[PDB]
């Protein structure tokens, strides 16, 4: 029963906890996978900026999953945002990628 | 018409200084540099789901109290005999313009020298500051917030609200302009009226004042449980979707052919909550803010000195020797009294009442646990940091969780009709 | 000219809202004008896990 | 629905136009003429039995996903608000017709008689039907309607008093429902206009 | 201020935001179009049955047919429409020849007026003749 | 008034605006009037931009039409609802398989007239029942489309 | 480009103003729905118009209710019956050099009367088209009262 | 027909749904005939889904008619016998005491 309420005149937007309290988009959250699956587009458009630059960290409960490995040269700059953005955006109600 | 403009600042909660620090003060300025905008005080959740929280602002009452502390600290700067606006700092904050347009970080030259040594429980007059004397519109827009600050700061309990019953303020076409409000929640009406109040000065007996008074009286009368669907005040009442829940939604409603008989004459009273649950609901803070907006324009009857501690006694525009006493109530007992009246009149059965009581009990316990945990965290932080003591919420005590004087207030409210 | 139709002008005691129906229809009155809004119905549908 | 309690099996449905304190012609409505309770409809047994003996689900059904995908586009095209407004107007129109037809007939209806001093005759079913049709057309014109409105009321004696419905059990017992009319702003405005 | 017609005749800084890209690939089950067309067909309101009701000058609207014959004719028409709709030659679900002896059923028609008489002759004609019987002329 | 030639309407609307230059019946009538009741004398505290939500004015109208329109305005105002009720209704109708939300900003000049009573719905249903009149062509589409 | 209130995707800032005004934020569809798990908004437009550019038509025939009038809320008007003109002392009033002509609230006539003419001085957006119009009594108004049941007059 | 039955559940008060009169055995039916036995099977599983209030009586009287000459039940009327067709029992007054 998570419900997002928008912010007004500079007030931060909020989402509802299980306890009934409404919290802003920064902290340690626990999600089950299905919640992101069934609200994919809305959740992306709300949370991706705050995950990319803000201080939001989310734990997704998956159980078992496949994986892919990408290697890199440690002596040079490396950033993993493109791969993770693609993975997040390719989540649909019925399927996920590696 | 009000002609005396006095306000009183907050007192310390056992600490050595104002209960705010730099981090909290800078975290407040979300809508801009001005502490005068309404959004600095109130939060628009827009849902009945409710119960907003944060790391530094656990509750709505927390935000209201922190804003009160910030204003109490900052306003003591221009109010010195010299009357200069930005020559000294309070917690590295400075007034940025003579008309108090906003707060900024102090200049480096100011930061070199020691800050202002604030003292608590001060009573100040707006007419002493010359720019407030010269411009009635400026005095109007600032007193809109100063009056609500005083209503919070007068006593150690929750905020005060004013309820009036009178059949003479219904004259004219006010009935139609009230019927225009059907279907809106109390939060919507209160927020919009409070926002509108600052636009221009208004008349003491005008339509706006009588509108606000009627809205306040209807809300409180329906809240106590006197006015309901089968006993209405000129066909108006407030319907609650589910009483006793964590965040309640009250909706203005019309019912035909159940109008109650109202005696002639004008009467009023002052009511307030005493349990810490006032931190957790939004309706009571909205009622207090409407009362403050009304006070900024019109002169209300004085509060008796017996109801307030000696620091709040003999304030020229707020308290006096003869007047109305304050009626303090406790939330969970008021739920039972509401259910009692409704079930006695036949609107409610016994099983529905039992369901309401279960909800009220568990809600009260949950809120009490959260408030106690936050208070413990505050005390530990104060022990760890002796130079930056603070309180996120107005202090409370265990004995305040009692039933004191609830039934007396319920009878006093019922006597108005 | 019938002064009765124009009561609230010719009577220095008459309160502005007063009318004399059904006997006499007045030709000068007070009218209340609004600027109401009428939005569509907008809804957001979310799934239940 | 009743399983085998014969005394409670309902076989009749009727619509009533007259109040509960008058004696008139026993003008029963058309729905009573059916042998059954409603209009008969025939079904093939073979198709039903085949549909019962065969039937299956997809091997990958999740009810939440299926019903979200089923309900969203069905609700996205909804017309309940327009229906509510239409019902409000229909009730207004019925009450207006009753009040205005009381004035030119012997209807046993309490209405403040203001225009009695204007000469008139005493109207039968044909005259009242013409008058009621004109009223219905005028109201449809004012509110810009084109479908049905007050049409079934014009097909008999339009000198009515009150709409009600009822149905009958096998043992003679009856159940009668009479809606409790709220106000009607059009009718009160018309009465005010007559007073002026 | 905008004029609204009548359908019925009167009396005459970087803009780019992180998560906004549209590379999602999902197909619905059931599909949107199928349920949309079915709901469109279900949205339709009922037809107006004005047979047996007055005209704007008193004459009755309908056809001069007996009521029970009218009911049986309508049952046949509805059954044919059902057969058309399911594309079969013979309807599986029928409104006529059902095993119920429903021989007393009555339906509205143009064969009767409001006072219970027959429309062998329109009401306006009867008014005209009954009035013409009482006319008088200038003296010879 | 909107459109051209607003000065003609200025002359028509406010009788007192003409002075008392001559002697005549009209001049006597004008001199019999009080001078402080021409124009607007009441406006709302709430405003959008710099114009109020509602205004009270003194104008050339008639009492009967004003009464009719006031009653109609009240009738419409008793039907108003708010989007939270829309949320509750559409959430309960769906039987918990989806949830519906409807954001909005606070206001009191919003109007969404949709609330009615049970008696009105029952009256409409009875009308619709009489409409069938044992005509199967009326009911065949309903069953077919629902199936 | 997008609305943070509802999660829509748009292509114009003025259309953005329209969208935000739909939520009640100060800067023809009747219903609009959006879903959270894909990109597929749906809107409804009345079946009155021939324009159905990807929208859904609404068959329900619902009566017009909210309508607006910008004229005078008066239904009785004053008409002169016998004309006339009379000499006067004053013709116009002057300020510095310009002259302003006197104009009367009521006609200057020998006899004038009151007639019924609904919405004679109105300005509406939607017309309900049910006017009752009275000519001055020096003319004939019998067709007003012969309208309803007079089909077979001699 | 299967979908129409469920649709007609909602409108019990204006439309009554019954099984077609040709769905019963042809002349009377007899228990000696295999086709008539399959007819009984199909009819018996089809009947409970209609809104006809006399379905159980018709379900009983079908097998009652088919069993003529092998088993006899007590009939009170001298006009209505065990050989009255099962379709004719369409109103509550036709229910037999047996």
Curated annotation (Swiss-Prot), chain B:
Stored Pfam families: Sigma_1_2 (PF03084)
Chief localisation class: virion
Record keywords, A-Z: Capsid protein, Inner capsid protein, Virion
Phenotypic consequence of residue 322 to V: In strain: Mutant ts447; temperature-sensitive
A single GO cellular-component term on record: viral inner capsid
Subcellular location: Virion
UniProt similarity note: Belongs to the orthoreovirus sigma-1 protein family.
Role according to the record: Inner capsid (core) component.
Subunit description: Interacts with protein mu-NS; in viral inclusions.
Additional remarks: Mutant ts447 is temperature-sensitive.
Protein name, entry field: Inner capsid protein sigma-2
Biological source species: Reovirus type 3 (strain Dearing)
Classification of source organism: Viruses, Riboviria, Orthornavirae, Duplornaviricota, Resentoviricetes
Gene of this entry: S2
């Amino acid at each position: 029963d998570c419900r997002i309420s928008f912010g007004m005149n500079g007030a931060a937007p909020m989402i509802r906890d299980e306890t009934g309290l409404m919290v802003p988009f920064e902290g340690n959250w626990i999600f089950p996978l299905a919640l992101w699956q069934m609200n994919t587009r809305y959740f992306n458009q709300q949370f991706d900026a705050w995950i990319k630059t803000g201080e939001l960290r989310i734990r997704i409960e998956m159980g078992a999953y496949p994986y892919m490995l990408h290697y890199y040269d440690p002596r040079q700059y490396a950033n993993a945002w493109n791969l993770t953005s693609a993975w997040l955006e390719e989540i649909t109600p019925t399927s996920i990628p590696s | 018409a009000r002609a005396a403009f006095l306000f009183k600042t907050v007192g310390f909660g056992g600490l050595q200084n104002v209960p705010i620090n730099d981090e909290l003060s800078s975290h407040l300025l979300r809508a801009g540099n001005s502490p005068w905008q309404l959004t600095q005080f109130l939060d628009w959740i827009s849902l009945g789901r409710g119960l907003a929280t944060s790391a530094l602002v656990p509750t709505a009452g927390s935000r209201y109290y922190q804003m009160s502390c910030l204003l109490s600290g900052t306003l003591q700067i221009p109010f010195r005999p010299n009357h200069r606006w930005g020559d000294i700092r309070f917690l590295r904050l400075v007034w940025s313009a003579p008309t108090l347009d906003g707060l900024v970080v102090a200049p480096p030259q100011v930061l070199a020298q020691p800050a202002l040594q604030a003292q608590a429980d001060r009573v100040y007059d707006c007419d002493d500051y010359p720019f407030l004397a010269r411009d009635p519109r400026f005095k109007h827009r600032v007193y809109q917030q100063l009056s609500a600050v005083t209503l919070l700061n007068l006593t150690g309990f929750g905020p005060i609200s004013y309820v009036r019953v009178d059949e003479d303020m219904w004259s004219g076409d006010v009935n139609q302009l009230l019927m225009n409000y059907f279907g809106h929640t109390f939060a919507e009406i209160a927020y919009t009226l409070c926002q509108a109040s600052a636009n221009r000065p208004w008349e003491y007996d005008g339509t706006y004042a009588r509108m606000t008074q009627i809205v306040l009286s209807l809300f409180w009368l329906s809240y106590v449980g006197v006015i309901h669907q089968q006993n209405t005040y000129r066909t108006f009442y407030f319907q609650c979707n589910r009483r006793g829940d964590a965040a309640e939604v009250w909706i203005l409603s019309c019912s035909l052919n159940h109008s109650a008989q109202i005696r002639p004459g004008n009467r009023s009273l002052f009511v307030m909550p005493t349990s810490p649950d006032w931190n957790m609901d939004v309706n009571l803070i909205l009622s207090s803010t409407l009362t403050g907006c009304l006070c900024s324009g019109s002169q209300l009857p004085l509060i008796d000195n017996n109801s307030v501690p000696a620091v709040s006694r003999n304030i020229h525009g707020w308290t006096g020797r003869a007047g109305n006493q304050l009626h303090g109530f406790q939330v969970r007992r008021m739920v039972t009294e509401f259910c009692d009246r409704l079930r006695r009149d036949g609107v409610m059965t016994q099983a529905q009442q039992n369901q309401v009581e279960a909800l009220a009990d568990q809600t009260q316990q949950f809120k009490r646990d959260k408030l106690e945990t936050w208070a413990r965290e505050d005390d530990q932080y104060n022990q760890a940091h002796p130079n930056s003591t603070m309180f996120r919420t107005k202090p409370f005590t265990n004995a305040q969780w009692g039933r004191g004087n609830t039934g007396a207030t319920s009878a006093a409210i019922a006597a108005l009709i | 000219i019938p002064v009765e139709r124009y009561n609230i002008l010719t009577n220095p005691d008459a309160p502005p809202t007063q009318i004399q129906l059904p006997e006499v229809v007045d030709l000068y009155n007070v009218v209340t004008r609004y600027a109401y809004e009428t939005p569509p119905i907008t809804a957001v549908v979310m799934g239940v896990p | 629905y009743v399983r085998l309690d014969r005394d409670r099996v309902p076989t009749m449905v009727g619509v009533t136009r007259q109040s509960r304190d008058t004696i008139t012609q026993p003008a029963l409505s058309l729905s009573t003429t059916n042998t059954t309770v409603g209009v008969p409809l025939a079904l093939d047994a073979r198709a039903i039995t085949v549909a019962l003996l065969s039937g299956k689900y997809p091997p990958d059904l999740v009810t939440n996903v299926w019903y979200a995908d089923a309900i969203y586009p069905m609700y996205a095209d909804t017309e309940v608000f327009s229906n509510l407004q239409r019902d409000m107007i229909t009730c207004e129109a019925v009450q207006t017709l009753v009040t205005l037809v009381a004035q030119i007939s012997e209807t046993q209806y309490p209405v403040d008689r203001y225009l009695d001093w204007i000469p008139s005759l005493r109207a039968s079913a044909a005259t009242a039907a013409t008058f009621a049709e004109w009223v219905n057309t005028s109201m449809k014109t004012a509110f810009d309607l084109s479908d049905m409105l007050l049409e079934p009321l014009l097909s008999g004696d339009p000198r009515m008093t009150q709409l009600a419905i009822q149905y009958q059990q096998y043992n003679g017992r009856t159940f009668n429902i009479i809606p409790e009319m709220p106000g009607s702003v059009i009718a009160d405005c018309v009465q005010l206009t007559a007073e002026v | 201020m905008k004029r609204i017609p009548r359908k019925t005749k009167g009396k005459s800084p970087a803009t780019t935001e992180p998560g906004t890209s549209n590379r999602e690939q999902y197909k619905a089950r059931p599909g949107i179009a199928s349920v949309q067309r079915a709901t469109e067909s279900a949205e339709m309101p009922m037809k107006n049955n004005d047979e047996g009701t007055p005209d704007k000058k008193g004459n009755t609207k309908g056809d001069l047919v007996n009521e029970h014959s009218e009911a049986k004719d309508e049952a046949d028409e509805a059954t044919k429409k059902q057969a058309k709709d399911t594309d079969k030659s013979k309807a599986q679900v029928t409104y006529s020849d059902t095993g119920i002896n429903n021989a007393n059923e009555l339906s509205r028609s143009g064969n009767v007026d409001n006072e219970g008489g027959s429309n062998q002759k329109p009401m306006s004609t009867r008014i005209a003749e009954a009035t013409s019987a009482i006319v008088s002329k200038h003296p010879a | 008034l909107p459109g051209p030639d607003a000065e003609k309407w200025y002359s028509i609307m406010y009788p007192t605006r003409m002075g008392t230059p001559n002697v005549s019946k009209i001049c006597n009538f004008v001199a019999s009037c009080v001078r402080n009741r021409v124009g607007r004398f009441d406006r709302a505290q709430m405003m959008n931009g710099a114009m109020s939500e509602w205004v009270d004015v003194f104008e050339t109208s008639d009492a009967l039409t004003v009464s009719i329109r006031g009653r109609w305005m009240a009738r419409l105002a008793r039907m108003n609802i708010n989007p939270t009720e829309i949320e509750w209704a559409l959430t309960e109708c769906a039987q918990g398989y989806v949830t519906v939300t409807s954001p909005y900003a606070p206001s009191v000049n919003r109007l969404m007239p949709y609330r009615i009573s049970n008696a009105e719905r029952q009256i409409s249903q009875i009308i619709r029942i009489m409409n069938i009149g044992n005509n199967a062509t009326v009911i065949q589409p309903v069953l077919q489309d629902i199936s | 480009y997008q609305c943070h209130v509802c999660s829509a995707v748009l292509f114009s800032p003025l259309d953005l103003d329209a969208h935000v005004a739909s939520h009640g934020l100060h800067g023809r569809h009747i219903t609009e729905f959006i879903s959270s798990w894909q990109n597929h908004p749906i809107v409804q437009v009345s079946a009155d118009v021939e324009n159905k550019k990807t929208a859904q038509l609404l068959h329900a025939d619902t009566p017009r209710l909210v309508t607006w009038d910008a004229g005078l809320c008066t239904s009785f008007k004053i008409v002169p019956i016998v004309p006339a003109q009379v000499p006067q002392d004053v013709l116009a009033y002057t300020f510095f050099t310009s002259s302003y002509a006197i104009q009367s609230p009521f006609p200057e006539a020998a006899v004038s009367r009151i007639v019924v003419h609904t919405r004679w001085a109105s300005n509406v957006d939607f017309d309900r088209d049910s006017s009752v119009i009275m000519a001055p009594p020096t003319e004939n108004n019998i067709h007003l009262f012969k309208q309803l049941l007079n089909t077979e007059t001699l | 027909s299967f979908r129409v039955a469920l649709a007609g559940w909602l409108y019990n008060g204006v439309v009554t749904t019954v099984i077609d009169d040709s769905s019963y055995p042809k002349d009377g039916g007899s228990v000696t005939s295999l086709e008539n036995l399959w007819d009984f099977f199909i009819l018996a599983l089809a009947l409970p889904l209609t809104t006809d209030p006399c379905a159980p009586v018709k379900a009983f009287m079908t097998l009652a008619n088919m069993m003529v000459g092998f088993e006899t039940i007590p009939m009170d009327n001298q006009i209505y016998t065990q050989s009255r067709r099962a379709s004719a029992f369409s109103t509550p007054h036709t229910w037999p005491r047996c």
